[PDB]
């Protein structure tokens, strides 16, 4: 382990890290500790391990106050450090936030982009962080982003797939499992809901926010959809109604005219998460407060605004004396917030540099987290200078593609389309005439394919027909036509590859990215767990 | 070594990457609509197909290698 390491940090020292400049490893003092005033509290996670998930649902319908669920584990990060938050700095702070902040109703740190990120570039899994995170936090109630069939990759994966991962993430410490279409389509979300019910946690089914519901103009998603898609989430039993604004579209006047028409429609509690790309998620949090929404997703300060989410630290004084306050230690999160501070200068290699608030993100309605990544995946390309260009083409290719809801996988597939159509140099009457010797990604393909389920209006025929030339196109839940995987034919041919028997956790790991954890692998072989290195001996040597 | 541009014999990627691997021979028989090659950005892949119904004369690059936008990948006669 020690050859391992010395092998890590010569490599590092000498060739660079991988995607980032090779910099002069500069001396950091060592993050500040929080000071906190720690007051012993009844948790939602205490609720759920004794009483049950329709208990956290009560005691959230009960909570007069807003109640906070913390991004800064994985969101925030996401989208501003293009998700490389180790998991050292977390255990740094993650006792502090089990402690001084047990007012939240949960923390966001896992799912998402992570689950990829993690092992992909940060050579840690994120089981372990997981697990670690779970024995740091334990009054701490946790929430994973889940995108439905789609898990956490980006393509459909099979039902019982789905259900293990469900299965083996609740039973590693995931208590609140936030299940999303990319779509809006009910039977991607239904499986994951059931599977989240039988194991005893809390399913969020989860309303991806597009367009303007007070935009006469724009009737494609209207508050009556949104409405007829809350009631259809409702009657499959889901604990906690979520409404996803990836992008921050949700205009505070509209933020308090959906979740109005929203409680008099259904029963469930409402948790609303946005980005703060416009400038305006605190005042849509508030509109949403005034209009009574259970729970709001926020981060903290030294890693809010942009296209992370509104400040913890904010939104409690934005709250202070109206009628709802936020439950929160403001005290404690401004503590909290110097040690996220300090780590933040660990990750200059990977800031995205956004200063200023786009009132752009209305017309292109690029999702906070594809913000960063979209420019970097331009740059690998060749045109990254060329943003505005790409994000003008993003606009296009939506209107082309029937003005679907973007966020991951389908933002990925509007932002590949967006990609190869400056890169190439096409236009929206080109691909209509000379689609058919073009051959477009994979990710478009698969898309008018059917993989990433049924749009709202369907495709269009047209650009459809073009875009798949002879593949076939299905209709229905891409999870019926998936064959059904045998975990133990799996488990086999894993341990025959890494050389050990593997955990549930393992197997299920090499089912979402097949590559990608044994390229996770063969590095362990190599440079051993490098998640125990601080992060500018990790990044610099 | 950069394919042309206009004529669709030679076939190029889009994006700088790598060729993982390359499934079909050296000058064999293509028909319309079937991948040949596959090309990679850093999360993306693009398996190209076949824009006609032709066969190979010589192929230019080889398995891992890598790629360049636009550059000449198989020239298909
Ligand atoms: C790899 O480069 C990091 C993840 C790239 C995809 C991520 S996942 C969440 C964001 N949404 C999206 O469509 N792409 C981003
Ligand atoms: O990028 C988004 O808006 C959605 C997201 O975080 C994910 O599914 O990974
Ligand atoms: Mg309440
Ligand atoms: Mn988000």
Same mark, same amino acid.
């Not at 991004?71 to 925030?76: K, M, Q």
């Given at each position: 382990?020690?050859?391992?390491?010395?092998?890590?940090?010569?490599?590092?020292?000498?060739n660079?890290?991988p995607?980032?400049?090779?910099?002069e490893?500069?001396?950091?003092?060592?993050?500040?500790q929080?000071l906190?005033?720690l007051e012993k509290?009844?948790?939602?996670?205490?609720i759920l391990d004794?009483?049950?998930?329709?208990?956290?649902?009560?005691?959230?319908?009960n909570?007069k106050?807003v109640?906070?669920t913390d991004?800064?584990?994985?969101?925030?990060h996401?989208?501003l450090?293009?998700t490389?938050?180790?998991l050292?700095?977390?255990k740094?702070?993650?006792?502090?936030?089990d402690q001084?902040?047990?007012?939240?109703?949960?923390?966001?740190?896992?799912?998402?982009?992570?689950?990829?990120?993690?092992?992909?570039?940060?050579?840690?899994?994120?089981?372990?962080?997981?697990?670690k995170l779970?024995?740091?936090?334990?009054?701490?109630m946790?929430?994973?982003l889940?995108?439905?069939?789609?898990?956490?990759?980006?393509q459909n994966?099979?039902?019982?797939?789905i259900?293990?991962?469900?299965?083996?993430a609740?039973?590693?410490?995931i208590?609140?499992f936030?299940?999303?279409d990319?779509?809006n389509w009910?039977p991607?979300?239904?499986?994951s809901?059931?599977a989240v019910?039988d194991n005893?946690?809390?399913?969020?089914?989860?309303?991806?926010y597009?367009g303007?519901?007070?935009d006469?103009?724009?009737p494609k998603?209207?508050?009556q959809?949104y409405?007829?898609?809350?009631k259809?989430?409702e009657?499959?039993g889901?604990?906690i109604?979520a409404?996803?604004?990836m992008?921050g579209?949700?205009?505070?006047?509209?933020?308090?005219?959906?979740?109005?028409?929203?409680?008099d429609?259904?029963?469930?509690?409402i948790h609303?998460?946005?980005?703060?790309?416009?400038g305006?998620?605190?005042?849509? +949090?508030?509109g949403?407060?005034?209009?009574?929404? /259970? %729970?709001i997703? #926020?981060?903290?300060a @030294?890693?809010a605004? !942009?296209?992370?989410?509104?400040?913890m630290?904010?939104?409690?004084?934005?709250l202070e004396?109206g009628?709802r306050?936020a439950?929160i230690?403001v005290?404690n999160?401004?503590?909290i917030?110097?040690y996220?501070?300090?780590?933040r200068?660990?990750?200059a290699p990977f800031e995205?540099?956004?200063?200023?608030?786009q009132?752009?993100?209305?017309?292109?309605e690029?999702?906070?987290?594809?913000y960063?990544?979209l420019?970097?995946?331009?740059?690998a390309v060749?045109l990254?200078?060329?943003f505005?260009?790409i994000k003008?083409? +993003?606009?296009?290719?939506?209107m082309?593609?029937? /003005? %679907?809801?973007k #966020?991951?996988?389908? @933002?990925?597939?509007? !932002?590949?389309?967006?990609?190869?159509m400056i890169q190439?140099?096409?236009?929206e009457?080109?691909?209509?005439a000379?689609?058919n010797?073009?051959n477009?990604?994979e990710?478009v393909?698969?898309?008018?394919?059917?993989?990433?389920?049924?749009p709202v209006?369907?495709?269009?025929?047209?650009?459809?027909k073009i875009?798949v030339?002879?593949?076939?196109?299905?209709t229905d839940?891409?999870?019926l036509?998936?064959?059904?995987?045998?975990?133990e034919?799996?488990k086999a041919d894993l341990?025959?590859?890494?050389?050990?028997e593997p955990?549930?956790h393992?197997?299920?790991s090499?089912?979402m990215?097949?590559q #990608?954890?044994?390229?996770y692998?063969?590095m362990?072989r190599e440079?051993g767990?490098?998640?125990?290195?601080d992060?500018?001996?990790?990044?610099?040597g």
């Open positions: 382990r020690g050859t391992k390491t010395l092998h890590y940090l010569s490599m590092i020292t000498v660079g890290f995607g980032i400049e090779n910099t490893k500069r001396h950091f003092e060592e993050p500040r929080p906190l005033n509290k009844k948790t939602a996670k205490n004794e009483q049950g998930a329709d208990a956290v649902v009560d005691y959230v319908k909570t106050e109640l906070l991004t800064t584990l994985r969101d925030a996401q989208s450090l293009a490389r938050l180790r050292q700095d977390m740094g702070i993650a006792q502090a936030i001084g902040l047990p007012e939240l109703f949960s923390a966001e740190m896992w799912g998402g982009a992570t689950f990829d990120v993690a092992y992909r570039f940060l050579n840690e899994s994120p089981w372990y962080r997981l697990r779970r024995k740091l936090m334990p009054n701490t946790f929430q994973m889940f995108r439905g069939s789609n898990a956490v990759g980006y994966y099979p039902d019982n797939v259900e293990e991962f469900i299965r083996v609740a039973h590693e410490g208590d609140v936030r299940i999303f990319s779509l009910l991607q979300m239904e499986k809901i059931q019910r005893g946690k809390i399913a969020e089914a989860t309303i991806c597009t303007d519901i007070l006469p103009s724009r998603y209207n508050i959809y409405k007829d898609l809350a259809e989430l009657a499959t889901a604990h109604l409404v996803k604004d992008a579209l949700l205009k505070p006047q509209a933020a308090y005219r959906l979740i109005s028409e929203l409680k429609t259904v029963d469930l509690p609303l998460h946005t980005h703060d790309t416009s305006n998620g605190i005042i849509t +949090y508030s949403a407060t005034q209009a009574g929404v /259970d %729970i997703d #926020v981060a903290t @030294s890693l605004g !942009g296209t992370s989410q509104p400040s630290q904010s939104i409690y004084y934005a004396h009628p306050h439950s230690n005290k999160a401004e503590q917030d110097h996220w501070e300090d780590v200068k660990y990750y995205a540099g956004i200063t200023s608030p009132t752009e993100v209305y017309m292109h690029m999702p906070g987290g594809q960063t990544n420019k970097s995946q331009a740059a060749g990254g200078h060329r505005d260009e003008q083409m +993003y606009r296009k290719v939506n082309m593609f029937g /003005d %679907i809801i #966020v991951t996988p389908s @933002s990925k597939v509007v !932002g590949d389309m967006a990609l190869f190439n140099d096409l236009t009457e080109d691909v209509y000379r689609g010797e073009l477009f990604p990710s393909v698969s898309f008018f394919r059917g993989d990433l389920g049924q209006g369907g495709f269009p025929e047209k650009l459809q875009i030339k002879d593949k076939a196109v299905i839940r891409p999870g036509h998936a064959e059904k995987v045998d975990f034919t799996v341990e025959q590859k890494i050389g050990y955990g549930d393992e197997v299920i090499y089912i990215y097949p #990608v954890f044994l390229d692998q063969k362990q440079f767990a490098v998640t125990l290195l992060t500018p001996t990790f990044l610099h």
